[PDB]
Amino acid sequence: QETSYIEDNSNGAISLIFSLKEEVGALAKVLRLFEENDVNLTHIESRPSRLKKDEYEFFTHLRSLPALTNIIKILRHDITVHELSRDKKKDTVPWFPRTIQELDRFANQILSELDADHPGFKDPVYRARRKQFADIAYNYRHGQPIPRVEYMEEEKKTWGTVFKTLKSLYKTHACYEYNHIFPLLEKYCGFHEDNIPQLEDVSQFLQTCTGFRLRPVAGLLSSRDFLGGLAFRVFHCTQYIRHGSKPMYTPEPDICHELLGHVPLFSDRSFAQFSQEIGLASLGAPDEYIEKLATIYWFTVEFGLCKQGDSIKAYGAGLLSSFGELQYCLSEKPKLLPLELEKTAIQNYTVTEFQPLYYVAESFNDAKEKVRNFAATIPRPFSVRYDPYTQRIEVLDNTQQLKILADSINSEIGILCSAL
């Protein structure tokens, strides 16, 4: 079977989320509870609430269980609290990153290079060169510029072989959005047959296009971690390349799969929103619905097809980076079905051979709304929204007050921008 769902592995991170009113002396009453239980002001933030203006929002990221199981009791009865845990005990919500900076916590929790069947296994250089890229990811923290790497001549050859063979297929097999950005990457990035572009230059390009940014990663994270990073429009990226012995095969993601399959789509604004809704749906979702999201991600982002007029084309990264399947998925051999998440979430699939079937999406805006509807069925005691101004996640139990405030803004832009 070998599905793409990777369970999350874990001192388990324990974080709290709660807001309180300023009617009685609230800041003093809460801060003293933390100082008395050996908690400095560095593991607690107090920010104003946007939904009432007379409330404070509190964030705690705590290693110290006996000093933590006592605050929850005194805090809940004497006055709403959401407990986030990485080990996901009962009566708790699965932990998720509240700010882009918190992505640094579990960015190095990949599994296991060390696979005997890997193409480049009987190679001391390649096996060692992989450790170099892994160290870049393990030591990278948010905000930092992605360290640049000088690719060897033997490695640019592999890139060239994959680049030239796929560039000939994009004009006819890739969706319009792909061919819309690709010329830009050829001019403003090092997207050339005889050059490998640096992830830093690409990240800076995405940031100026849709706000998406890249993050080095050593290997494969848990599905929870990966999708969680999409809520912040952060895409964990590998910096290594396949072994030059078989440029047309890879059991794992490499810079080729992600630069030629993933990056161009994240440059489109409509697609950035769609993929973001998938990540947003994973924040605090149980493991049962994470696998469902991983399956949707598989049949939409990696191996998804889209309707373009009277014809169909491909937009999945797994398809746009594979020379053989990109032609097989567009033929009349595979089975095509309309995109319906209730069926895709449970559909079984394989990772070794080509996909027997493909799901066709009407559009990205159409697929986006399907994710929102599916996000509602996911049992969560709150709603989530991303704030690009502060780059934090907003926990929303009365989420309805914020969506309306966004409409009142968008509507005043249609009557003001009235040229004629």
Query: What are the catalytic residues?
Result: 257, 262, 302, 321
Are 217 and 137 contacting, i.e. CB atoms less than 8 angstroms apart? Answer: yes
Q: Which stretch binds a second copy (CB under 8 A): 123-131, 293-301, 322-330, 409-417?
A: 409-417
Residue 4 binds which entry of a second copy, Fe ion, none, CB below 5-8 Å type-dependent: none
Tell me the β-bridge partners of 174.
314
Sequence-ordered alpha helix ranges (H) in 246-363: 255-257, 263-266, 269-282, 287-297, 317-320, 325-328, 341-344
Distances (CA, A) of 139 to 11, 146, 237, 241, 274: 20, 11, 14, 19, 30
SS3 label, residue 386: strand
Are 316 and 271 contacting, i.e. CB atoms less than 8 angstroms apart? Answer: no
Task: Provide the mask over 153-192, with x wherever binding to a second copy is found by CB under 8 A and - wherever it is not.
Answer: -----------------------xx--xx-xx--xx----
Closest residue (Cβ) to Fe ion? 317
Rounded CA separation 207/151 (Å) = 24
**282-321 binders of Fe ion (CB under 5 A):** 302, 317
Q: Which of 13/351 has CB closer to Fe ion?
A: 351
* Residues annotated in a binding site: 257, 262, 302
Work out whether strand 81-85 and strand 14-21 pair parallel, antiparallel, or are unpaired: antiparallel
Q: What residues have CB less than 8 Å from 342, skipping those under 6 apart?
A: 374
Sequence-ordered alpha helix ranges (H) in 48-123: 69-77
385 binds a second copy (CB under 8 A): yes
**326-355 binders of a second copy (CB under 8 A):** 337-338, 340
**79-118 binders of a second copy (CB under 8 A):** 99
263 binds Fe ion (CB under 5 A): no
Residue 317 binds which entry of Fe ion, a second copy, none, CB below 5-8 Å type-dependent: Fe ion
Which of these, 408, 399, 395, lies nearest to 96 by C-alpha position? 395
Q: Which of 6/314 has CB closer to a second copy?
A: 314
Min dist CB 111 to a second copy, Å, is 32
Min dist CB 161 to a second copy, Å, is 26
230 binds Fe ion (CB under 5 A): no
Exactly one of 4, 5, 22, 81 binds a second copy (CB under 8 A); that residue is 22
**Which phi and psi angles does 359 have, rounded to 5°?**
-105, 130
Residue 69 binds which entry of a second copy, Fe ion, none, CB below 5-8 Å type-dependent: none
Min dist CB 41 to a second copy, Å, is 7
> For residue 117, what are its two tokens?
């069947």
Exactly one of 207, 324, 350, 356 binds a second copy (CB under 8 A); that residue is 207
Name the residues that contact Fe ion, by CB under 5 A. Answer: 253, 302, 317
